[PDB]
Amino acid sequence: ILVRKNIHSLSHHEAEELRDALYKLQNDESHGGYEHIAGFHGYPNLCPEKGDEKYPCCVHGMSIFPHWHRLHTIQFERALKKHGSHLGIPYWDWTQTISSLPTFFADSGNNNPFFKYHIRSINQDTVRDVNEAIFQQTKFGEFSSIFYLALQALEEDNYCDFEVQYEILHNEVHALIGGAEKYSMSTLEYSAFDPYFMIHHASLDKIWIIWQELQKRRVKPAHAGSCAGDIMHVPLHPFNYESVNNDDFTRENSLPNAVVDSHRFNYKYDNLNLHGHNIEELEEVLRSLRLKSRVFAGFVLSGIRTTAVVKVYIKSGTDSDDEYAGSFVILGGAKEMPWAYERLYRFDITETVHNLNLTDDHVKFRFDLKKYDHTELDASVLPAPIIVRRPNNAVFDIIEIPIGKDVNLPPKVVVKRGTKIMFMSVDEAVTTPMLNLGSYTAMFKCKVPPFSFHAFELGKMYSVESGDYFMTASTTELCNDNNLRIHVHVD
Amino acid sequence: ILVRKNIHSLSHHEAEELRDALYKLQNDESHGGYEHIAGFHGYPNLCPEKGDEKYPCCVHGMSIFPHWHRLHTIQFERALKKHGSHLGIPYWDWTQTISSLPTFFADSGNNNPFFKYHIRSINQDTVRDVNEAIFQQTKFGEFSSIFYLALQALEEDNYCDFEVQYEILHNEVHALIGGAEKYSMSTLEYSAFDPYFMIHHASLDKIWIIWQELQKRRVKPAHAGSCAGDIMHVPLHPFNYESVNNDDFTRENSLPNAVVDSHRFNYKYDNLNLHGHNIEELEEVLRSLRLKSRVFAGFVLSGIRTTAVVKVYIKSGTDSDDEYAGSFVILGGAKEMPWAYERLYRFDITETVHNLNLTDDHVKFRFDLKKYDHTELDASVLPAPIIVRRPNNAVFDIIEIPIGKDVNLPPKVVVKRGTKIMFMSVDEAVTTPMLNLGSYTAMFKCKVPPFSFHAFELGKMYSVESGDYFMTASTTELCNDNNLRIHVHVD
Ligand SMILES: [Cu+2]
Ligand SMILES: [Cu+2]
Ligand SMILES: [Cu+2]
Ligand SMILES: [Cu+2]
């Protein structure tokens, strides 16, 4: 019987309840206190039952990334109501044209509890190094910045391929807000303490909702167990571990398959509209993208044990003229629990490609540069972008063009039974054999037969069948000249 | 309405029909001829629809190894009846004490069509280099040689862990019969032509049958799709390809899930007794093994693109005194289609170990020597034996002790939900951390967290839970000092 009203439709009278509730919680050091709730995600680490090895309970990159967050956000909200609340956590639609940071934060003075919070555990206040994060261009379709990504998440079908777009989209915000500060909102291991953090995740949660049932309207209900669900059949840590917020709902309903439905944790949003668009209205904008063929840059991101950014630079035919193809962010931090996107990260680079006039399957590759919160780091681990072209009219097929030679990436799962696959003949040195489904992981360690062309993967081709595939080098030796062994998988 | 009567209970009158039927087939060069039927398995290769790359349709090592064979044997039999037969293909129980090779073969003179056959395609007659393959010791339990293996196949539960024991057992015979001859019955790429071959596989088929329903008597019905079945949902090549024996039954019922039941291809055996033991009687002998703890030497055999033998030598405490721990055979041949046992190969070495007095989990390893049809070959690719101890009373649990350092093998699947696992602390240089379930294949490529001991795998321990596991080196560097990354799996 609670509701997360918009932070914009907020009223002075309403504003009070929020500040009072949060303050009372902030000055609370009990297991249900604010210094303890923010401790779940960032530092200090806990989860493992006395493993004396710490461990960030923050679940990022995993298939349940949104599941652990959706429950944590309600944990924050529930803790408030218990401390004297009236309305739910205010959400902020940061997709729309941002003219300035919410006055709910900016009001640093008057000791606003929503702008920052004193860690208390190891001192240090929650500081933020705001970034531009603005520059209008055009709304209502083709909205530059944020919105596109968010709208590109609802666009995606299936949940496992959606989760990626869901996270990456939310990864952006964290950066601009926390900037490059020590214990900022961008620093995974501390971003949890920030007042915004607790409420920001709610803003993202709302997007999940709109998409959740949005799928139902496409005879493609995706929510609980769909694809990589073996990871879901396990309670969210440390919500289940005996030392949680002790909130009957959380401590027990910590199971991912239970947190899948929001109408269970007693709370609803004032609306289900994004960027001023209603579900039916917004569903139209989505139809716009699908009406225009766009080339995407596949990414098989993997845990870099740290949060940072990455500027995608497209090579030009001139001589080397780079190009700001865009830029995304990867959350994380040393001591984080290992993760690796099983699914590809749909990233649009359409226009950028058309400028230098290159083909998706034809000789097309680029060299991007990544960067930590502030300093430069090993841009090495790309891992080799896996170009993917999504045809316009008549979609939900998507083509997948891996590569041939100098490719770098573990088994990529484009999933979405019915998807198309191919290979990049990049580098003429290597022809177009590329074994195919060698056999099982064992064989995948490169052990191709004596010229016995176990055909299946040729030049510019395609697929349609599902199941478990694979792609190894034409010959045994031509395998170790780049480690060609991308184990593609379906479903 | 046909029957495969024993080759021993055979009578002169009956013998004729068999010789006539086979002869008429042998001198038949049509698509349903004998030179064409034997062509399905060995050379010349076919299967792929005009891939001009040949391809041995012989399916060995795969989970459907017995499925493709069971259908081929009926193909041979059906071809005969169509050419004038009366009884089914005679089976020979080679498990029992062998006093001498069947007189159905030995009768070289009189131009016996069952002793050999002229390839005709590329000349050369079917020759065999018989091996001793005898030496009585004791029957009715603990029968040295053959029978043990066969009885060790019915012993095993589940079908995927059975198929291995099923093949390896049948792999033996091939050797002794073909010996070390060019186009012998031991040479995969030609063994198909041999008259025995066509009938021998029928002998093995009978064992599959007795085991098939034998399981049903243990409330554990395993036949069609059980474990690795994705490989079954595909017709057996080239039985389906348009150019098969054109036998309505084969050409159509080529689907593995259909060949699972024999009572479908119109044919039954004169009995279902092995080594003179009835199903109920034999089921007792099985109860004997389970009543005595036996240590086994796990094996994750993988396609060596050739058929050969391997002598397991156990190291002694003396100084290096080896020991004839036994010996098995691996069928195959250059140009063969890639295979790799997903499941482990149960091989008993009990007594051998007790002599030098060593412990399964404790410092225990051995160096075996493998050999091609006649010459020595790279004994390299072991791959590191994965010792497994099967406790007596109260079985169907099996313990799995992999290893720590200098281990070599892809993801091993002990399956059998409820199985136990551990690790060999062999080599004190490496302690007992061994990460555990790092994450997904991506993470498995070694990328363990910063000392963050994602506990699960410790010293002499165990398991019980199912699902997909894994085991990586304690530290990132300690991983590449042997490539510790055996991806264990259950179910
Ligand atoms: Cu987080
Ligand atoms: Cu977050
Ligand atoms: Cu065979
Ligand atoms: Cu065989």
Swiss-Prot record, chains A, B:
<feature type="binding site">
    <location>
        <position position="60"/>
    </location>
    <ligand>
        <name>Cu cation 15</name>
    </ligand>
</feature>
<feature type="disulfide bond">
    <location>
        <begin position="47"/>
        <end position="57"/>
    </location>
</feature>
<feature type="repeat" description="WD 7">
    <location>
        <begin position="180"/>
        <end position="221"/>
    </location>
</feature>
<comment type="similarity">
    <text>Belongs to the tyrosinase family. Hemocyanin subfamily.</text>
</comment>
<feature type="binding site">
    <location>
        <position position="69"/>
    </location>
    <ligand>
        <name>Cu cation 15</name>
    </ligand>
</feature>
<protein>
    <recommendedName>
        <fullName>Hemocyanin 1</fullName>
    </recommendedName>
</protein>
<feature type="disulfide bond">
    <location>
        <begin position="446"/>
        <end position="479"/>
    </location>
</feature>
<feature type="region of interest" description="Functional unit h (internal slab)">
    <location>
        <begin position="1"/>
        <end position="491"/>
    </location>
</feature>
<feature type="binding site">
    <location>
        <position position="41"/>
    </location>
    <ligand>
        <name>Cu cation 15</name>
    </ligand>
</feature>
<comment type="function">
    <text>Hemocyanins are copper-containing oxygen carriers occurring freely dissolved in the hemolymph of many mollusks and arthropods.</text>
</comment>
<feature type="disulfide bond">
    <location>
        <begin position="160"/>
        <end position="227"/>
    </location>
</feature>
<feature type="binding site">
    <location>
        <position position="201"/>
    </location>
    <ligand>
        <name>Cu cation 16</name>
    </ligand>
</feature>
<feature type="glycosylation site" description="N-linked (GlcNAc...) asparagine">
    <location>
        <position position="357"/>
    </location>
</feature>
<feature type="cross-link" description="2'-(S-cysteinyl)-histidine (Cys-His)">
    <location>
        <begin position="58"/>
        <end position="60"/>
    </location>
</feature>
<comment type="subunit">
    <text>Homo-didecamer, with two decamers assembled face-to-face at their open ends. This didecamer form a stable 25 nM cylinder wall.</text>
</comment>
<feature type="binding site">
    <location>
        <position position="170"/>
    </location>
    <ligand>
        <name>Cu cation 16</name>
    </ligand>
</feature>
<feature type="binding site">
    <location>
        <position position="174"/>
    </location>
    <ligand>
        <name>Cu cation 16</name>
    </ligand>
</feature>
